[PDB]
Amino acid sequence: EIVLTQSPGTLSLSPGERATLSCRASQSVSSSYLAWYQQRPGQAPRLLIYGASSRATGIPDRFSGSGSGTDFTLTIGRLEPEDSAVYYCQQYGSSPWTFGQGTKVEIKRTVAAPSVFIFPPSDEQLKSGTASVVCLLNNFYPREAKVQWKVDNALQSGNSQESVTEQDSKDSTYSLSSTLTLSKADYEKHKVYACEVTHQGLSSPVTKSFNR
Amino acid sequence: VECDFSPLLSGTPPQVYNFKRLVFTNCNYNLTKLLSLFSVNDFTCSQISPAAIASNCYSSLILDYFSYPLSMKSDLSVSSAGPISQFNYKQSFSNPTCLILATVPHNLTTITKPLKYSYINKCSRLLSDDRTEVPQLVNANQYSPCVSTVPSTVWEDGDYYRKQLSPLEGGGWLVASGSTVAMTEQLQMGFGITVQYGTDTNSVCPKA
Amino acid sequence: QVQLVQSGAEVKKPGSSVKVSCKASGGTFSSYGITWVRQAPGQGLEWMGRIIPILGISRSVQKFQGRITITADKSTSTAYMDLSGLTSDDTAVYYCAREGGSGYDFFDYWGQGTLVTVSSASTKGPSVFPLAPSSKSTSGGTAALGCLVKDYFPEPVTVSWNSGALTSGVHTFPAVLQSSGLYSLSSVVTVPSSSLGTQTYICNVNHKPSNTKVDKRVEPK
């Protein structure tokens, strides 16, 4: 049993910048008995470093491994956008083998003026249940995007629910899907529905239009 | 020319699978002058009486010593089929054999304590072919060929040590495992004497 | 280099039993353990146990001891856990991973993972919802269309387009809890094939618990 600290956590760094990840151990561990792992957005963790010095067979040697006794540091000499992942330092030194809290690397490249689209309800769940409208915000950086629903030119309450996907391995961009489920009957005089987006991207709030 | 049990009374006595040996081929022995220094607990002998091993002349007296708790005195004999008598330490059935299971007293000094008693639970070989497995059974004392993988003492409750033999010979992972047992307040040791007589000669003799 | 293929999201009830089966594609359990590794949803990995089919030996962490049995069938070469006596707090994704021995117990190759979901609420079917591509959109580059999956309870539902062909702009959003314990996720794809926006008539969805598969065709309205 060894509780262990990690790096600050979320890190914003431009591509081509060195990244340092720390792994202090509350209890002393062997100078070379710790292994740094990397898990991609939605997948199984892949071994990056074993023994705190050696590299896993087929791992590009940007991911240098060092540190001994108490503090172990993983240093990524160059950064590409295919490094955005969660890194865990596991001390297979003691027992039971304690995984690290984990650090998240976010590669800081672009601000991606977003693309806003509406997908207004159609006559398949307007023939059962509760319909739902949706607002897609495809290709945008970073995660600082807020969408508020506008109904018949009147602002809406907190009955939304926004879901944002993780950055793509090559694209390194963040797409969104704010949803407004409604009572299946309530589509009478509310002629128009829209989502208002505020972003680093694009001067204005980019509102939209349904009519139909 | 007295027999030298002196090296027996120092250091950390080794675990069961790594038992050290003392062969005496010419000396005079007073065994009770040793067993007085311990608190004997189980004196069991086969092919010669437990009292008969005290006074009679042989050709060579072989003594093996190690740390073995009383909790599992059942495993150590020709009766058992467990891992102590099959992957750790097997003494020749051909010639006479005594087996003592003793205990260290407080008033004895410089018998230091190993942290725990560990033994080789399993020793197999996984063939260079598909998945065929052949256990490794230790012959007469043989040091249990899995001994190179396993360290002097096993660390945790159940461990897993494997090596790859260099290809030819024989591509087979000489896999081995180790298991430990809790420490006891007093070091509990096990000794094995394997006397064998001679053609028409006798050296080791009861120093009376 | 052995790929590890596991089983699929058991939904059990607080007070049940789950046999997660990790398969050793190759036919070959060599001198190689399987170590199991929890990960509570939105949390950080733990250790749960290790076995070696070559020797049959098993070991378990102290907390999970008396509730877990990790076995393997060396002959057919397939390893399983059986977390009997489990509570609602064990709802987590469980991985299986390859040992290396004594001083080299780092987890080399991993399994895809098998989300166990343990609470006596329900199992509900992926009611797929209208797509309805927007008319006046981009000038050809990205005509966005997506077939939505709402109203289902137990995750997972994988939704590939073109039954796993169109893999170049399939944006999938993580399911978010609705008013009921059910949650919903949305799948979208971008086509340059503007007029008629057609070949995407698969929108294949697979639900591991319900075992219900729905395929629909997209029409530009």
Numbering used by the authors:
A (entry chain K): 1 to 212
B (entry chain I): 381 to 588
C (entry chain H): 1 to 221
Question: What do the study authors state?
Answer:
Coronavirus trimeric spike (S) glycoproteins mediate viral entry. S1 adopts dynamic conformations in cryo-EM structures of prefusion MERS-CoV, SARS-CoV, and SARS-CoV-2, wherein RBDs adopt either a “down” conformation that buries the receptor-binding surface, or an “up” conformation that facilitates binding with host-cell receptors. Here, we report the isolation of a potent neutralizing monoclonal antibody, MERS-S41, from a yeast displayed scFv library using the S protein as the bait. By combining cell surface staining assays with cryo-EM structural analysis of MERS-S41 in complex with the MERS-CoV spike trimer, we have demonstrated that MERS-S41 inhibits MERS-CoV entry by blocking binding to the receptor DPP4.
To obtain better resolution of each RBD-Fab interaction, we performed focused three-dimensional classification and refinement. The resolution of each RBD-Fab ranged from 3.7 to 4.3Å, allowing us to build atomic models with sidechain accuracy. The binding interface between MERS-S41 and the RBD consists of 12 residues from the RBD and 15 residues mainly from MERS-S41 heavy chain. Specifically, the RBD residues L506, Y540, R542, and W553 interact with S30, S31, and Y32 from the heavy chain HCDR1. The RBD residues K502, L506, E513, G538, D539, Y540, V555, and S557 interact with R50, I52, I54, L55, I57, and R59 from the heavy chain HCDR2. The RBD residues Y540, Y541, and R542 interact with G100, G101, and S102 from the heavy chain HCDR3. Residue K74 of the MERS-S41 heavy chain outside the CDRs interacts with residues L506, R511, and E513 of RBD. Only one residue S95 from the light chain LCDR1 interacts with E536 of RBD. Thus, a prominent feature of the interface is that recognition is mainly mediated by the heavy chain. Comparison of the MERS-S41 epitope with the DPP4 binding motif of RBD shows that there is an overlap with 10 of the 12 epitope residues, suggesting that MERS-S41 binds to the RBD from almost the same direction as DPP4.
